[PDB]
Task: inverse folding
């Protein structure tokens, strides 16, 4: 179902994706 | 389903995508 | 389904795409 | 479905695209 | 479906494209 | 479908294109 | 479908093109 | 379909082209 | 389809071209 | 299809061309 | 069901994806 | 059901994914 | 049911996934 | 039911997954 | 029922998974 | 019922899993 | 009922699993 | 009822499992 | 009822399992 | 009732299991 | 009732099991 | 009632089992 | 009532089992 | 009542079992 | 009442069983 | 009442059983 | 009352059983 | 009352049983 | 009252049984 | 009262039984 | 009162039984 | 009162029984 | 040859021994 | 040859021993 | 040869021993 | 040769031992 | 040779031992 | 040779031991 | 040689041991 | 040689042990 | 040599052990 | 040599162990 | 040598262990 | 040598272990 | 050497372990 | 050496483990 | 050495593990 | 050495693991 | 060494893992 | 060493992993 | 070392991973 | 070392990953 | 080390990844 | 190290990625 | 390291990416 | 490192990207 | 590092991008 | 780094981009 | 870095862009 | 960096742009 | 950097633009 | 930087623009 | 920077513009 | 910067404009 994959360097964040409702 | 992948360097953020509703 | 991928350096943001409704 | 990819440096923003409705 | 890609430096913005309805 | 790509430096803006309806 | 690409420096704007209806 | 590309410096504007209807 | 390209410096404007109907 | 290109400095304007109907 | 996998270096964060409700 | 797998180096964090409700 | 597996090096953390309620 | 398996090197941590309620 | 199995080297930790309530 | 099995080298720890209540 | 089995080398520890209440 | 079995080399320890109350 | 069986080499220890109360 | 059986080599120890109260 | 049986080589020890109270 | 039986080689020891009170 | 039986080679010892009080 | 029976080779010892009080 | 029977080879010993008080 | 019977080869010994007080 | 019977070969000994007080 | 009976070969000994006081 | 009976071959001995006081 | 009876071959001995005081 | 009876072959001896005081 | 009766072959002896004082 | 000797209190009896044929 | 000796209280009996044929 | 000796209280009996043929 | 001796209370019986043929 | 001795209470019986042929 | 000795309460029986042939 | 000794309550039986042939 | 000893309550049986041939 | 000892309640049985051939 | 000892309740059985050949 | 000991309730069985050949 | 011990309830069975050949 | 111990309820079976050859 | 221990309910089976050859 | 322990419900099976050769 | 432990419900199977050769 | 543990429901199978050669 | 653990429902299979050679 | 764990439903398969050679 | 974990439904397959050589 | 995890439905396949050589 | 995770439906395939050599 | 994740439906293929050499 | 993710429907193909050498 | 993501329908192809050397 | 993303329908092709050397 | 994105239908082609060297 | 995006239908081609050297 | 975008139908071509050197 | 965009139908061509050197 | 845009139908050509040097 | 745009039908040509040097 949900995936995140790579070189991930996120800082001090908020991050969203919706698929569905 | 949902993916994010690369060199990701997001800071102090809000980020959205919708697909669906 | 939803993807973001590259060198991503977004700051102090809001970002949207719709496909669907 | 939805993609953003490159060198992305967006700041203090709002950004939209619609395809569909 | 929807894409944005390059050197993107947008600031203090609103941005739209429609294709579809 | 929808694309924007280059050196993009838009500020304090509103921007639209329609193709379709 | 819809494209914008170059050195884009638009400010305090409204911009439209129609093709279709 | 629709394109704008160059050195674009438009300010305080409204801009249109129709092709189609 | 529709294009604008050059050094564009339009201000306080309205601009139209029709081809088609 | 429709083009405008040069050094464009139009102000406080209305501008039209028809080709077609 | 839910997955995260790569070289993950997230710091001082909040991160979300929804698929479903 | 729920999985995380890779080289995981997360620090000082909060991390979430929902699938379901 | 619930799994975590790889080279896991998480430090000073909080980490969550929900699937179900 | 619940599993963790790999090379696990977690330090100074808190770690959770829910599946169920 | 509950399992942990691999090369496990956890230090100075707290670790949880729930399945059920 | 409850199992742990592998090469287990845990040090200076606390470790939990719940299944049930 | 309760089992632990492998090469077990735990040191200076506390370790728990619950199944039941 | 309760079992432990393998090559067991635990040192300087405390170890628990509950099943039941 | 209660069993321990294998090659058991425990040293300088405390070890517990409960099943029942 | 209570059993221990194998190759048992425990040294400098304390060892417990409860089943019952 | 109470049993111990195998090759037993315990040294410098204390060893307990309870079943009952 | 109480039994011990095998090849028993215990040295420099203390050994207990309770069943009953 | 009380039994010990096998090849018994205990040395320099103390050994106990209780069943009853 | 009390029994010991086998090949018994105990040396330099103390040995006890209680059943009763 | 009290019995000992087998091949008994005890040396340099003390040996006890109680049943009763 | 009291019995000892077998092949008995005890040497340099002390041996006791109590049943009664 | 008191009995000893078998092949008895005791040497350099002391031997006791009590039943009664 | 008191009995000893078998093949008795005791040497260099002391031997006792009490029943009564 | 007192009895000894069998093949008796005792040598260099002392032998006692008490029943009574 | 006192009896000894069998094949008696005692040598170089002392032998006693008490019943009474 | 006192009896001895059988095949008696005692040599180089001392032999006693008491019943009474 | 006092009796001895059988095949008696005693040699080089001393022999006693007391009953009475 | 034949002997009976002791305190003999036989009643309402038949008694036999054979030695010879 | 044949002997019986002790406190003999046999009643309502038949009793035999053979030695010889 | 044949002996019986003790406190003998046999009733309503038949009793045999053979040694020889 | 043949002996029986103790407190003997046999009733309604048949009893045998053979040694020899 | 053959012996039986103790508190013997056998009833309604048959009993045998062979040693020899 | 053959012995039986204890508290013997055998009823309605057959009982054997062989040693020899 | 052959022995049985304890509290023996065997009923309606057959019982054997061989040692030898 | 052969022994049985304890609280023995065998019923309606056959029982064997061999040692030797 | 051969032993059985405990609380033995075997019924309607056959039972064997071999040691030797 | 061979032993069985405990609370033994075997029914309608056959049971074997070999050690040796 | 061979042992079985516990609460044994085997029914309608065959059971074997070999050690040796 | 060989042992079985616990609560054993085997039915309609065959069971083996080898150690040795 | 060989052991089985627990709550054992095996039915209609064959079961083996080898250690050795 | 070889062990099996738990709640064992195997049916209509064959089961093996080798360690050694 | 070899162990199996848990709630084991295997049916109509063959099962193997090797460690060694 | 070799272990299997859990809730095991394998049917109509073959199962292997090697470690070693 | 080798382990399998969980809820295992394998059917009509072959299964292998190697570690070592 | 080798582990498999979860809800395992494999059918009509072959499955391998190597680590080592 | 090697692990597989989850809800595993593989059918009619071959599956491999190598790590090492 | 090697892991596979999720909802795995592979059919009629071959699957590989190498890490190492 | 190597992982695969998700909803995996691969059919009639070959699949590889290398990392390392 | 190597990962694949999602909804994977690959058929009749060959698939590779290299990272490293 | 290497990842593939999404809805993957590749058929009759060859697919490569290199990063590294 | 390397990623592919989306709705991927590639057929009868060869596909490459290099980054690095 | 390297990414491809969208609706990808490539057929009978060769495709390359270089970044780096 | 390298990206391709959209609706991609390339056939019978060769395609390149360089950035770098 | 490098991107291609749209509706791409290239056939029988060669295509290049350089940026850099 | 480099982009191509639109409805692209190039055939039997060679195409270049340089920016840089 | 470099862009081409529209309805592109180039055939049997060579095409260049330089900007830079 | 460099752009071409419209309905482009160039055939059998060479085409250049320079801006810069 | 450089642009060409319209309905372009150039054949068998060479075409240049310079702006700059 | 440089533009050409219209219905362009140039054949077998050379074409230049300079602005700048």
Result:
């Amino acid at each position: 179902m949900g995936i995140i994959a790579g070189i991930i360097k996120v800082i001090k964040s908020l991050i969203e994706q919706f698929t569905g409702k």
About this structure: The beta strands of chain AY are 7-8, 18-20. Chain AY is about 0% helix and 25% strand. Residues 2 and 18 of chain AY are 10 Å apart (CA to CA). Chain AY touches chain AX through 21 residues (CB under 8 Å).
